[PDB]
């Protein structure tokens, strides 16, 4: 059964609630982004209206074969009327096509559902600036002060510099980047751009990338692995055994692999700066874990919430334990007392 924090009161609406069968009283199903914990349950047999971004709708139609007549893509930053209720979709600074959703309830309540997001000051100048928000349904993935990580820009600088150094020292090195979902495309696109290569990948991953409206993409990606010196592989194969095996398959074109695993946070964040990151090495293979996050840090999250000044917060992540729930509630109270709302 659908949990309360996926239901929007005073509407017929649910958010990211496709794995519960037919939800009692739901007249429209919203999907914030195409990640499997959120789309779980959609297919060609789904016959209710799905509301989402244009990019999410491309992925629904092509990857899950949902029928066109049930996909309702909406433009961003535009007031739209859905089953008699005004809504707006805003960029969530998560993966491609990810949105936050503002609902203007008929009784005057305004609700923001962040979906998954990486808070940014740029959000303080969207259509959020223009009115009061009563209730916030918040992505609390990293809601604890130990979660610090660098900007995306610093992490991409590290990766480009690392890859360009290695391949310039050894023109026979291969770069490999791990992936298991959409998001984090900048990592592999930035490295391929500095090396003057396309990124090579499986037909299934190429298909997924062609649904994303990224400009000049035919220029950056390919399925011809032989023509590429940056390869994308499943995240599970980014280990010494999986990479040794891949190197065998390249037929003596390469004699070294430099591989990247973009993770979210790991505890090496608490001690080490990005500058200082080192790989694990075995023989002619090196693996770098880089902290490229598409979720808010604790400090980014706090700044957003203290700016927005909601009257009530409903966490959507880490809600399954009493210790997590109590921790989060304590931070929300600190933030409110410090800012004075
Ligand atoms: Ni996500």
Could you characterize the architecture of this molecule?
The chain has 341 residues and is an alpha/beta fold. It folds into two domains: 1-147 and 296-341, 4-Layer Sandwich (Metallo-beta-lactamase, Chain A), CATH 3.60.15; 148-295, Rossmann fold, CATH 3.40.50. 26% of the residues lie in helices and 23% in strands. The protein contains eight helices and 18 strands. It has helices at residues 36-39, 54-63, 152-169, 185-195, 203-210, 240-249, 298-308, 322-339; strands at residues 7-8, 13-15, 28-30, 50-53, 71-74, 80-82, 85-91, 99-104, 110-113, 135-138, 173-179, 199-200, 221-222, 230-234, 256-263, 280-282, 285-291, 312-315. The strands form three sheets. Strands 13-12-14-11-15-17-16 form a seven-stranded mixed sheet, with helices on both faces. It has a six-stranded mixed sheet with strand order 6-7-8-9-10-18. Helix 3 (152-169) packs parallel to helix 4 (185-195). The protein starts with 6 loop residues before the first strand and ends with a helix.
| Tally of domains | 2
Bound molecules: nickel (II) ion
CATH architecture of the largest domain: 4-Layer Sandwich
Rough outline: globular
Total number of helical segments? 8
Structural Rg? 22 Å
Percentage of residues in DSSP E strands: 15-25%
Please estimate the helix content: 25-40%
CATH topology value of the largest domain: Metallo-beta-lactamase, Chain A
**Straight-line distance between termini:** 35 Å
Largest sheet composition: 7 strands, mixed
PDB class: hydrolase
Keywords: SGC - Diamond I04-1 fragment screening, PanDDA, hydrolase
Assembly: monomeric
Entry title: PanDDA analysis group deposition -- Crystal Structure of DCLRE1A after initial refinement with no ligand modelled (structure 278)
């Amino acid at each position: 059964t659908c949990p309360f924090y996926k239901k929007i009161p005073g509407t017929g609406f649910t958010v990211d609630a496709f794995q519960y069968g037919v939800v009692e009283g739901c007249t429209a199903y919203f999907l914030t982004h195409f990640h499997s914990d959120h789309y779980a349950g959609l297919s060609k047999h789904f016959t209710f209206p799905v509301y989402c971004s244009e990019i999410t709708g491309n992925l629904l139609k092509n990857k899950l074969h949902v029928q066109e007549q049930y996909i309702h893509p909406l433009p961003l930053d535009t007031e739209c009327i859905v089953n008699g209720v005004k809504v707006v979709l805003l960029d969530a600074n998560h993966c491609p096509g990810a949105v936050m959703i503002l609902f203007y309830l008929p009784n005057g309540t305004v609700i923001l559902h962040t979906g998954d997001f990486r808070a940014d000051p740029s959000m303080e100048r969207s259509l959020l600036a223009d009115q009061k928000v009563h209730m916030l349904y918040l992505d609390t993935t990293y809601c604890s002060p130990e979660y610090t990580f660098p900007s995306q820009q610093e992490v991409i600088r590290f990766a480009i510099n690392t890859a360009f150094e290695a391949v310039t020292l050894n023109p026979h090195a291969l770069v490999v980047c791990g992936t298991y979902s959409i998001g984090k495309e900048k990592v592999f696109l930035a490295i391929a751009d500095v090396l003057g290569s396309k990124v090579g990948m499986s037909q299934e991953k190429y298909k997924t990338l062609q649904c994303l409206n990224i400009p000049e993409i035919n220029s950056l990606i390919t399925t011809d692995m032989c023509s590429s010196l940056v390869h994308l592989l499943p995240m599970m194969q980014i280990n010494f055994k999986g990479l040794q095996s891949h190197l065998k398959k390249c037929g003596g074109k390469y004699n070294q692999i430099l591989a990247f695993r973009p993770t979210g946070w790991t505890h090496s964040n608490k001690f080490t700066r990005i500058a200082d990151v080192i790989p694990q090495t075995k023989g002619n293979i090196s693996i770098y874990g880089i902290p490229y996050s598409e979720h808010s840090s604790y400090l980014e999250m706090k700044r957003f919430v203290q700016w927005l000044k909601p009257q009530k917060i409903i966490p959507t992540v880490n809600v399954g334990t009493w210790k997590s729930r109590s921790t989060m509630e304590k931070y929300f109270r600190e933030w409110k007392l410090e800012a004075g709302y």
